[PDB]
Symmetry: D2
Subunit: 81 residues, 4 copies
Amino acid sequence: MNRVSTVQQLTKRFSLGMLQGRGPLKLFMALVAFLRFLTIPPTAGILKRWGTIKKSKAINVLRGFRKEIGRMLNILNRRRR
Amino acid sequence: MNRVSTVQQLTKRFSLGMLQGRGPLKLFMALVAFLRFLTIPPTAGILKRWGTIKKSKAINVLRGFRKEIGRMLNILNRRRR
Amino acid sequence: MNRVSTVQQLTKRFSLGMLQGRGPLKLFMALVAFLRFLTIPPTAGILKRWGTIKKSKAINVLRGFRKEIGRMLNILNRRRR
Amino acid sequence: MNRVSTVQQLTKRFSLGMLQGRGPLKLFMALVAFLRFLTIPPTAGILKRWGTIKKSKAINVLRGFRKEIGRMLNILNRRRR
Ligand SMILES: Nc1c(C(=O)Nc2nnc(-c3ccccc3)s2)sc2nc3c(cc12)CCCCC3
Ligand SMILES: Nc1c(C(=O)Nc2nnc(-c3ccccc3)s2)sc2nc3c(cc12)CCCCC3
């Protein structure tokens, strides 16, 4: 039903608060990964929350991210030869 | 100081055009990974660039991101809780 | 109760859609006035809606804006001598 | 073409810092007028700049804005509906 977002829909979803480390743990961890991929320093709010996340839950989320990059690599590899 | 970004600095860097698939390949790929991590549908402009991506360069970028997820697991491994 | 906004509160209120000419008539007219004050060209969406607004209602809103600039001038004049 | 702005162009021009009271006096005064038109409370940074404004320059800017409201009334006067 909803396979494509509009730019307006994404701006509605990605509020300024997430840049201060607000939001669901999965959103926060995805944003930290995004900044680290780009070597962009975190905000004070992101660094504060980075210190308080639960080790085991954060590790579980990151294993999921590692798998998802694997899925993306499978799509691109299966596209060329 | 370049250990922390201001929210102002991040809003400046992450211009609206990146939601239409504009920018350096590393920025584009980091955004695509971020959206896939969160199961957020891409925009038409993101999907068009995904479809026409230089596959070898994109694979190299994603391999680097996967190494960075490993580095994030290694940071969290050191914690007691 | 609410005499001051946070930056986050204002970003919540001022969605991307208003730059496309979406929103209450008063919001739209305030934005058109803001752009005209700065001699910034409108977007296609703003120019589209500018053509469809009701003359008498739009004029009423603008008379209110004219009065409000008068109130602001009264505050600044009463501050110096 | 400089008869229309893109939404992208406007997001570029209207940086987050202006919500903290940063920018050219004309930009600051246009934003203060816009918020007052809509009865939206200012931020602490906007209020601080309002309190310390160069009153003569600010009055000159607002007189120009009031002339522009007149020009907008003159445009709408010409319409049949
Ligand atoms: N530019 C963005 C956004 C954006 O510009 N949102 C805006 N919302 N309102 C805006 C605005 C700006 C000026 C006037 C009126 C409204 S811009 S949201 C967003 N989310 C992401 C990105 C960018 C933006 C890319 C970085 C990865 C996180 C996801
Ligand atoms: N920058 C603004 C806004 C803004 O940056 N909103 C954002 N919302 N989400 C953003 C974002 C950006 C990147 C990543 C995640 C979230 S920026 S809203 C807004 N509203 C006004 C102005 C600016 C902004 C000034 C012009 C007069 C209209 C009122």
